[PDB]
Symmetry: C2
Subunit: 80 residues, 2 copies
């Protein structure tokens, strides 16, 4: 019943799969789901983040996603 989450891609995917599948059941038109995300993001960023490192981790999260978007869109590195 204690901490047995060894951080698995299998464990993660199961979580994200449900999150998406559940949202899919209600079937949000993107807009609403982003607002729920916004609500939750604010809630988390004001509760579960280091007080003095809030800006840093918030920038890191964003930055990492921006990079993810970059390599997502740009995936034809060699020979364009």
């Amino acid at each position: 019943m204690a901490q047995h989450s060894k951080y698995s891609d299998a464990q993660l995917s199961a979580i994200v799969n449900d999150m998406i599948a559940v949202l899919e059941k209600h079937k949000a038109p993107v807009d609403l789901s982003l607002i729920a995300l916004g609500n939750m993001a604010s809630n988390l960023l004001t509760t579960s983040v280091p007080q003095t490192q809030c800006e840093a981790l918030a920038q890191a999260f964003s930055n990492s996603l921006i990079n993810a978007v970059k390599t997502r869109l740009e995936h034809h590195h060699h020979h364009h």
Copy 2:
């Protein structure tokens, strides 16, 4: 108080509420919860909305969240 959803503030709240519920249903730490959210956030922006524009909106929304956290600590106002 302000508006949260222009369509159904009730449906929005229901989505955010059940989102927390489905999270608790799987039992995920703040780490994995953010990892799933990160994959979700990025995947949606890179599918539902214009690629070259969602990147900017991501930054704008992210910076807006930064402003929220910033001005929560900088919640000062002696002048009006």
